[PDB]
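#dry-run=false #mode=assembly
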Amino acid sequence: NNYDGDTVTFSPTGRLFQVEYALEAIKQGSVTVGLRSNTHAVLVALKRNADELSSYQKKIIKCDEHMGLSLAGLAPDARVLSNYLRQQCNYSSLVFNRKLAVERAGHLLCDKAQKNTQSYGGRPYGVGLLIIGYDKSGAHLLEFQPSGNVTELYGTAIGARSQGAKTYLERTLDTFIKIDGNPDELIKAGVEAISQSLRDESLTVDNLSIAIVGKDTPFTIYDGEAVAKYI
Amino acid sequence: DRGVSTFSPEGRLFQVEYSLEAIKLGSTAIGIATKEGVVLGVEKRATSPLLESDSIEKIVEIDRHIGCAMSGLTADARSMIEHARTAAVTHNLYYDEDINVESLTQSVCDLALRFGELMSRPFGVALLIAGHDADDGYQLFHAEPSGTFYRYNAKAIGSGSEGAQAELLNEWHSSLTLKEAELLVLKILKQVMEEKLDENNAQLSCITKQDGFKIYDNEKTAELIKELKEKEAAE
Amino acid sequence: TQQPIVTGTSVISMKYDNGVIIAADNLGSYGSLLRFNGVERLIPVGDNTVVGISGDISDMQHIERLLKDLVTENAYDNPLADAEEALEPSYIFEYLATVMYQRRSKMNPLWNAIIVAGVQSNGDQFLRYVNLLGVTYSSPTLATGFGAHMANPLLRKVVDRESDIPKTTVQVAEEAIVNAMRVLYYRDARSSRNFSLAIIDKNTGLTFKKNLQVENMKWDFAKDIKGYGTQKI
Amino acid sequence: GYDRALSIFSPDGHIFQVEYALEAVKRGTCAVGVKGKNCVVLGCERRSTLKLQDTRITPSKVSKIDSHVVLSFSGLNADSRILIEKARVEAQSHRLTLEDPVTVEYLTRYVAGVQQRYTQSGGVRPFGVSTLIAGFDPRDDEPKLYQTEPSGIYSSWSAQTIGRNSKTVREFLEKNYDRKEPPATVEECVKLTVRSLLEVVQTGAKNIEITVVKPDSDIVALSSEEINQYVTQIEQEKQE
Amino acid sequence: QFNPYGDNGGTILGIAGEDFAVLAGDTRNITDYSINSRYEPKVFDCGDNIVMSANGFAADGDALVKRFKNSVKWYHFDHNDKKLSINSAARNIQHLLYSRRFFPYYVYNIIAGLDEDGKGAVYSFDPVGSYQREQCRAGGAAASLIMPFLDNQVNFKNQYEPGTNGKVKKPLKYLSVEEVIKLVRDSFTSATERHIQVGDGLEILIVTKDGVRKEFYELKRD
Amino acid sequence: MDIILGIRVQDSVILASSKAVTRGISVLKDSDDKTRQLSPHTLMSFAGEAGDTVQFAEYIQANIQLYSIREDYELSPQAVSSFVRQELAKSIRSRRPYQVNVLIGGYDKKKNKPELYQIDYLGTKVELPYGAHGYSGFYTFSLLDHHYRPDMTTEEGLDLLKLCVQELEKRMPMDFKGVIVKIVDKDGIRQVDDF
Amino acid sequence: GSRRYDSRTTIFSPEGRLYQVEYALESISHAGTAIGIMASDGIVLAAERKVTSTLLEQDTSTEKLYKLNDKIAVAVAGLTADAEILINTARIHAQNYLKTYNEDIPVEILVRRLSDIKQGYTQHGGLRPFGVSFIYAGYDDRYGYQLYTSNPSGNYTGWKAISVGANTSAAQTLLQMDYKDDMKVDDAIELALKTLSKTTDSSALTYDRLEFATIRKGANDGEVYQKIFKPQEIKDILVKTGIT
Amino acid sequence: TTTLAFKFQHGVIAAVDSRASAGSYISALRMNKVIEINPYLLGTMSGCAADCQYWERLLAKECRLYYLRNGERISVSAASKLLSNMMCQYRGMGLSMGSMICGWDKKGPGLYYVDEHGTRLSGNMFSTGSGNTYAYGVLDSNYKWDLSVEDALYLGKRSILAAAHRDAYSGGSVNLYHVTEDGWIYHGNHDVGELFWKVKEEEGSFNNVIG
Ligand SMILES: *[C@@]([C])([C][O])[C@](*)(=O)[C]([C]C1=[C][C]=[C][C]=[C]1)[N]C(=O)[C]([C]C1=[C][N]C2=C1[C]=[C][C]=[C]2)[N]C(=O)[C]([C])[N]C(=O)C1=C([C])C2=C([C]1)[C]=[C][C]=[C]2
Ligand SMILES: [Mg+2]
Ligand SMILES: [Mg+2]
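#status=ok
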């Protein structure tokens, strides 16, 4: 109200409204689902178009051979944060000959977002990210919020109507975690999960975007007729 | 007052949303992509008859394989065009090749959100970036001040955009020729323009793989206008 | 640009079937003066890596601190710091190699020659060299300074190529290293009798031996040598 | 440094500071530009509220940017000096790096770019100035006349006016100026420029300034008596 | 005074075929009169069917290769996983080298691959960035020993057709991969004999449309 | 470059400058004009290190032309010479000084007098009836000391200048490929096309 | 943050005016009147000190008339402290010009420079403008005797006769009436004092409430002399012209 | 190296050799020392190969940007000046670059010499490199404005040959260019070994050499 003019102002109840408004941009964004087993990690994203003449906005971005994310909210902010991850993943490789741990990647994103929430002049990031990766401690899935909060999860979903997919994964927890050494079945579970967030529209060939990473599987994105198999 | 980079309660940047309103006041610009080429056309909209209309430059060359049309606060486009031309030629310097249309568009869109309290406000102009490369062929992009860019088969921006876009919805198909696209841009421009369309107050351009980016002469456009009138009178 | 003041001499090392061995004497020389006699130039990093350093001691102490700080920093927000995400020899080496090449590129080098010896997660042997120029190389045997000229020839008789590594036991490799250290004591004017030796094995882990001495030395034949040519008495 | 964003968008998509800069131009004295077949003439109003003025030393309204290009303006006088100085520096900078004098179109594009920069830079306000830039390109006999404004847009004009009561003199020019046959001589071009100012000026004494620019760096400013003869001839024909 | 440069010896060799290319180099690393390693790889697969070797001062050579590999990675990110053509890589490397015009990468660089028409390509550089496409090039310590042999045996220089007596040249028939590898092995065997910095081992990288293949051959260890 | 001469007579200033330009052991050009018009009644000739000469002259030219446009007024030769001196005095203590020597010949329209200023690369200014730079003065000053009068005509000034060039052509080891002569008077600057 | 407290000194009103410049001019209209009159053989500067005291040391006091160099002087109307900042800058600029070209600075060039500094404070920096209006009286060999005025907007104009400060409307009308082109310095002196005597808000115009100066070619042969009048000399010229 | 270029009635001829050296070692037999900046602009190269390639390709970037901004080809005079200004920034930093900027613009054919000192000279004829003295000898005695395209191409070709023969650091092959108002025209690569024997027989020159 009087305490939402900038990010440097707490409300009387200890809330940061600009951060909460940035969080609101994620809820307006298109749905994206993340889930993993012990061997593989999968991203599934519902892409959004402007109209029938327009293309479908890309949702998934590759950060390294072993790591990448999906976005929901302001796409340009995802480009900035993914570019930062690309640089950090790359700094780890060039200096330490070491693949960046997914957990450490989350800590770096948290700290980068935090600086924008405590200083005058700037603004919080208006995007949420689901980071998947496979490192020395196996498969991983992270959820990033522009408040700075990063959370390691078995599965999750963000964006509009994401609660439906999140409930499904909460039921299926014991099943999809055990899908080891079977990428197609893990993707099926992700496609079935994101389907719980759909209304009116359904999953078409240029609508669906899938990504996967695993033990002997580099981070690869599937679009177009490559995802027709899963429709 | 209030921050320039402030979020609204709905989760939108106030300034970005306000710049979009400025673009709605701008003159109409239309782009149509085909397999034979991409056509770009604009409404010049001279404020007075004494204004020499040929000096109105709302269609612009970025590279030999990339063209650009603009709508909104057209003065803001000059630094964006300068950056685009620099990015296009710089990539040719570093990699001895033409730059991808998407990559060029992305470079322009990276400037968009570089504002705060960097420039003091977002750009008040939208761009239709049309071009061709070997990888993805003939392409048409719509670059906004939000930093977002959508690829389009056909797109209209400016004051008569939603009316023109609805018309492009029906008319566009994947087997359009270049000549058909030219007449289609002229048809829709004539529909949304206030003043009567002629070769002096409207401009055409195209990008083909062979000849590259070309702005059409007033004599060449005049014939296409005359060809349009006759085919509409034919039924 | 500088000049080295207090210096450490050769560091020698070799691979064997189940790991690596590295050794270096405990002397800190001040030109021709054998000034400091209790200097440790082998520095363990965790329980899987030993960094052996020759050259300027002040720069060595600086590197010793960078490594100590590297371990501290790796443990930050890392539940697997003593397991999967512990420091590997390859990580430690590349860090040092990055630092060395950067410093030479600023014309302000760390006046050292470094050998990083260790065993990786998968049990693979690691042995790589880096120096003040940022030059890097790997070989079944590695040695700095005088060791390059005198020790490598002896150690290469045991492991002449990659295929000789599985055939070489820890007893044979240690014996070869200890003999090489004796030869260096005979012939290097900036060496000492006292030295340290470290073994990193993929089964038995890190064994760090201190206060070793060169023994079984041959001097008796000196009594018979008289004059410089014609003298008989 | 002072970084405050003064020029910003409003809910309806307007930049008020740029629009208020146009109001400063509306307040400024009237300036007019007319290009003939082989010349361009720049007319300027001088408000007669200020008498006891020393016309020798008072800053003239028309300014030479180079030997072949001139610049007149309407709006804040102090603001105009900054643009003129920058333009003059760029004109010499162009000759120094490219070995050709600036084209009229290039100089206009530069001045317009400066004006635009001051509409999206922090801590600065827009120039309260619109300019008329006229001249002839090197080794070219085609007349050039351009206009700029605070927003940074520019365009070429057969004839144009800016400043207070510019709406009236533009109305006059739109009906009197024929594109198919422009003022063939210098006399006809000046006569039309004086006629257009006489719609607004008040008295035709020291209130009208005329500057004729011809090809090949031939620039001259008319005197009071020379202009007064045009004023006399116009009204004598009008009495009929 | 501190000398930031050094000489790690070695020699490299690139030959372009009709539909293939080879980049070879010895595996010996040296300082002065000592051997550092008998097997220290010098030729690298950089991705996109491109192979590269930077010979001279190993520290600068490793840095350049490391930077170019990085340049390839960022080319994929920035340009939608587009394949970096050999001509585009060459131009990119020129700019990497000239960035240090006043503190040079002390290396002679060679890259090899296929052009956009599928034909074999070799590009050659000097330490400061001048490059050009070539059919045949030897670089490094024994470059002056090997190049004349290649002028003679690859481009048939000073060779004429018998009976004509210098009136008609030997026609420029293309070479097969098997014939090229023979010239490479003989080139390095000859260089190993007469150059003290060359020996120990030979590693050859062959580039075809099918990918990058390796071949290793031992050399004299003296 | 090599030789630049200057002489101030009754009603004009005459500047003579060599035409040769040499790189390595080859004379690349034998028609080079080592001068720039700073203003309608002010001419500057120059000589010094390769490249620096033209860059400096053009930089000065741009600054004086900028002044002329700003004030709609021609600076006096004295004012221009002082501006040039300051730039050279500023330059000599820079990281890399501009190694340029100049003569400035101008006609002062206010005083109705010709004026010749000699300035070296250190910023050493002197007003003179006749002047030169480098070794040129060693050969020519004895002739000028003998023959010069202040009431000389332009034609007599040219004849005395011919004698100076003839002496240079006889006793200098270097071939400077003749001179381009320019006259600065009340009517402006003109070139003597036959010399 | 800090934005909350920013007055925004460099912005346009909806009518296209600069708020702070207009308010600075309002400040200046309450300042003591200063008058400049240019004649064929010299220039007069006359100015009124504001409500003085008997205990003010007049002979060592200077609030209105300042010397920029030997050829140029200024009369001040507004904040004296603000004027001294600008005056010291102008003094430096004149010396920079003299060092560069070895000639005294032309009057207009000095005026343009100061006016450009004032302009800058209205367009950028976020600072308040200088609440000062100058009358420049000077001489050079190009245009001869010259009068200029500058104000907080940074706009300057040339004049034959001009007033700044309080009652300029009334003062300008009186000057416009009695001024003629063939006028001389002694006549201009009389006109300046007569105009102040009629426009003044004080009961009577006395020597202790005035600062006076002339720039004359009335110096021995072709040269210019600045004369800052002393208290006793102002008293004498007041008697001579018949005011006291 | 040896390079030359000269103006004549039918445009401008540009001829260069193709050798490269690293001490006494001939490092390259066939190097392109001409850059095709645009269809109406050429640039010759002499000095440090790296400097020549980098800066002349950077010139082509800047000349291309000129066309985009102005909708018109850059003049030869302006192009040569941009290059000379680049040289002035790295003044005394150790660059080595001698070049001729050849082309056709509105003033007709244009030829400018530019070097690392920032020197910029207009003229009808230039020659740079270690063998320029040998080329000048042939050019000066045979050059006319009234030359035919065929005779002019031969003159530039024969002039490089003269230098290639005598100068140890010049040779390999000859690259010919002819600049017209419709643009430059490449007139091929000519091996000096073969060209020498051909010219010797047909012309009767090089009598001292046995063949
Ligand atoms: C004459 C052949 C020799 O003076 C001519 O000037 C050429 C000009 C040239 C221009 C473009 C391309 C090639 C050549 N110059 C050289 O050959 C220069 C001469 C030179 C060496 N050092 C030096 C020179 C000039 C001025 C200062 C210092 N030679 C080179 O630049 C040498 C270093 N280049 C090479 O040897 C190699 C080149 C080029 C090259 C090599 C080696 C390998 C692969 C591709 C290119
Ligand atoms: Mg040996
Ligand atoms: Mg001197």
